[PDB]
């Protein structure tokens, strides 16, 4: 199948510049009818920021044009963004997108990945565990910057009964989030449980076992 | 960011139909075609009709779009728990860019349920390193409307929690909210009691969940 996936999410600091590529598999990025990046606020709807032909020919959303650049590596069959003199108004989840054929009708989309503008720093989080006919445990996920974080149990094993919070913002300036769920009572004493977490803005991967 | 008008949300309950509309200008939606697209929570948007009223493979017939004038309209019909999401419009603007509304929120209607409630103490772990957070869950409940009161020795805390609230369940179509109350070490040890009440249209009185410190 075609997939796109952007670069992985982080941090910039206000007034420098946004780096983003897309790797396409299953596709030769030189076949594609464009390539594109929308973004998403958070909280809100979608803006477009650009899009670039087969011709090599560019077209920039016209608020934005001045400070971005949008390319294609044939060698690498990925594409980029470049968004210079960042500042919070570029905080959002960006996606990338094209269209494979211009016959076609339906474009690819990428993951998104959330870019934080801030002048705060990468903290990754600690993990601790919410100890346990029905039980509930879970993770805490404490003191971490930027967002996201995901988190899996038993290594995407358990989704039954799963919640995974939005984060809040602390007053510290770091979030904290918290995922749960609910299991049988009498499986405490013999299924293991482990919530799996990842901080990609900081390589932070820690799998956490919860015991009653 | 957004340029074109939706609703901010939409609810129904299943087997129903619900509208959602997008309304624009002369330039944009009066002169061109117009999509849209749903968005699952946490996910990237996927197009449910294109071109005003054409579906792409893959997506059922219970999908339906039109366009009138400088309006567009989508149409869900044979609504299921798994519809729930943001859904948005897109068209293209007097330059033949892009643009988009700013989202409608379907929600699903079902029964009320009442929350299930549980309260953690903070972990050991987290103890040694100097902070308690204690964390209280309600699970599963229907409306969104709950309200959590925090009591530790029975003084009501006012400031000191915050809350968040998941999106509707795709399967069962309700709610759970996880609110923490943070403490510092010292303080947590000054105190026995905490307990976490909850209040419900689904409970006939609060629930109290409770534990003492250390016990």
């Known amino acids: 199948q075609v997939q796109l996936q952007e670069s992985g999410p982080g941090l910039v600091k206000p007034s420098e510049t946004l780096s983003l590529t897309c790797a396409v598999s299953?596709?030769?990025?030189?076949?594609?009818?464009?390539w594109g990046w929308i973004r998403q606020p958070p909280g809100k709807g979608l803006e477009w920021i650009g899009s670039?032909?087969?011709?090599?020919?560019?077209y920039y959303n016209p608020s934005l044009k001045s400070r971005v650049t949008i390319s294609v590596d044939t060698s690498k069959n990925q594409f980029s963004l470049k968004l210079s003199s960042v500042t919070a108004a570029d905080t959002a989840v960006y996606y990338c997108?094209?269209?494979?054929?211009?016959?076609?009708?339906?474009?690819?989309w990428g993951q998104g990945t959330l870019t934080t503008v801030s002048s705060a720093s990468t903290k990754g989080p600690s993990v601790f565990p919410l100890a346990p006919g029905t039980a509930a445990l879970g993770c805490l996920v404490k003191d971490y910057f930027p967002e996201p974080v995901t988190v899996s149990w038993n290594s995407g094993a358990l989704t039954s009964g799963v919640h995974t919070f939005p984060a809040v913002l602390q007053s510290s300036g770091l979030y904290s989030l918290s995922s749960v769920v609910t299991v049988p009572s009498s499986s405490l004493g013999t299924q293991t449980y482990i919530c799996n977490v990842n901080h990609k803005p900081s390589n932070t991967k820690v799998d956490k076992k919860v015991e009653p | 960011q957004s340029v074109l008008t939706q609703p901010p949300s939409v609810s129904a309950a299943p087997g129903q139909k619900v509208t959602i509309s997008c309304s624009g200008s002369?330039?944009?939606?009066?002169?061109?075609?117009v999509s849209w697209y749903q968005q699952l929570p946490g996910t990237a948007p996927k197009l449910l009709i294109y071109?005003?009223?054409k579906r792409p493979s893959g997506i059922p017939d219970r999908f339906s779009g039109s366009k009138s004038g400088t309006s567009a309209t989508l149409g869900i019909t044979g609504l299921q728990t798994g519809d729930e999401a943001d859904y948005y419009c897109?068209?293209?603007?007097?330059?033949?860019?892009?643009?988009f509304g700013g989202g409608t929120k379907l929600e699903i209607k079902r029964t009320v349920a009442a929350p299930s409630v549980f309260i953690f103490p903070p972990s050991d772990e987290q103890l040694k390193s100097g902070t308690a957070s204690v964390v209280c869950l309600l699970n599963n409940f229907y409306p969104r409307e709950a309200k959590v009161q925090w009591k530790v020795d029975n003084a009501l805390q006012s400031g000191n929690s915050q809350e968040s609230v998941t999106e509707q369940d795709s399967k069962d179509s309700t709610y759970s909210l996880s609110s923490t109350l943070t403490l510092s070490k010292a303080d947590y040890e000054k105190h026995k009691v905490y307990a976490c009440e909850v209040t419900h249209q689904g409970l006939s009185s609060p629930v109290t969940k409770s534990f003492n410190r250390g016990e």
């Open positions: 299953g596709y030769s990025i030189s076949s594609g009818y464009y």
């Open positions: 997108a094209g269209l494979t054929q211009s016959s076609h009708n339906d474009a690819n």
């Open positions: 071109d005003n009223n």
């Open positions: 670039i032909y087969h011709s090599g020919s560019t």
């Open positions: 002369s330039s944009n939606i009066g002169n061109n075609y």
């Open positions: 897109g068209t293209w603007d007097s330059s033949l860019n892009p643009v």
